[PDB]
Amino acid sequence: QSSQALHIQTYCNSVRQQIPVDFGRFPNLRESERQINTGLGAARQHAEHYLKDIQPLIIRNVTNIQDYFETQNLISTVMPSGATKEQWLSALGMVSDKAKEYQEVSANTRRTIGSLNDKLIIDSNNYQLIVVNLNNVVNGNNGVLEQLNRDIDGINAAIDGAIAGIVVGGLLVIGGAIVTAIGAVASTPVVMGGIAMMTAGAGGVIGGAIVLDKSLSAREKLYRDRSQLNSEVLVASQIGSGYRGLQTQAQSAVTAATQMNNAWDSLTSELETLNANLRKGIIDDSFLRQLFLTASQTSVTKVLDGTKIIKQQ
Amino acid sequence: GYRGLQTQAQSAVTAATQMNNAWDSLTSELETLNANLRKGIIDDSFLRQLFL
Secondary structure (H helix, E strand, O other): OOOHHHHHHHHHHHHHOOOOOOOOOOHHHHHHHHHHHHHHHHHHHHHHHHHHHHHHHHHHHHHHHHHHHHHOOOOOOOOOOOOOHHHHHHHHHHHHHHHHHHHHHHHHHHHHHHHHHHHHHHHHHHHHHHHHHHHHHHHHHHHHHHHHHHHHHHHHHHHHHHHHHHHHHHHHHHHHHHHHHHHOOOOHHHHHHHHHHHHHHHHHHHHHHHHHHHHHHHHHHHHHHHHHHHHHHHHHHHHHHHHHHHHHHHHHHHHHHHHHHHHHHHHHHHHHHHHHHHHHHHOOOOHHHHHHHHHHHHHHHHHHHHHHHHHHO | OHHHHHHHHHHHHHHHHHHHHHHHHHHHHHHHHHHHHHOOOOOOOHHHHHHO
16 A cells, blocks of 8 residues: 555665676577666666656645645635725736646646656566566577486486496406316316406406496586576576566556556646636626636635645655 | 675665755755845745745
8 A cells, every 4th residue: 555656766776776687607698688787777767867856856846736725725706805806806817827837837747757657668668578588598498408308318328338338347357267267277268268258358348438438428518508508597587587576566666657647637637627717707707707716716625635645646 | 795785885876976966955045045035035024934
């Protein structure tokens, strides 16, 4: 149940805290980071203006209006007691002129609000664009991630195939040694078979080691890429959540601003009605004068309400 | 964290600069009222109702 101004004031200071980010480690997020940084910079400019100028200026105009209506609380449509008709006409004319100036001031505030609205709208849009750009990056990066997990699965098979050859070689050599030793009792074919088993066992152990060292070294490259992509995606999902939150803050501020625009528009219209009610009463002599003057008195209440309403906004 | 602290300080700088301009304006506005008073443009009757 926050006031429109406080909601924008919060969103403003929040955007100010938005730090500039470098996805320098992530090659696919290069354009995203720059785009985000630029948009963030622009939003910051919008906030500083809103905070340092806009909200204060709005407060000033409203205060002046509050003071004005305070003095001119009700137009005395009827001759109260002991004034000339000219004196009453002059006072009314003065009040009319002041209301006109106040009306112009109200229109000015509205224009300011309009600019603020456009600035916020542009910020929210740029934010959304960054979010989509990020969402796309992680939604692509997660196709790559699957092909990596599938390749990593295919790599472990060769890794085990090498582990198998290494063990088989170790046993063949072990068995070959026992056979060779037995054969060496006399019995040349047995010794040959034992030496052959030993030789083959060594060959398999050597060949497997070469393959294994290389196979893990292909596996390592794939895993490194997988981790890098995982990190990049997480970083994107991190900044993405933040931008998403900023986008919501702007969307709400847009509603708050639109509300303020309608409020000022109403005050401007109410002033125009009082001015019209006034003007027609000065160029009226008897009963029709009191009629327009009473309607203006009702105008005056409608403006006083619009003041209290804007003060709450 | 340091990066976030740097941003917090940068914003505080803007906040301070704003406060400096605000006080400077108040000081100038007082000088104008004083000048308006001294020359006989304002009166201690009307300036009282203004502050009130």
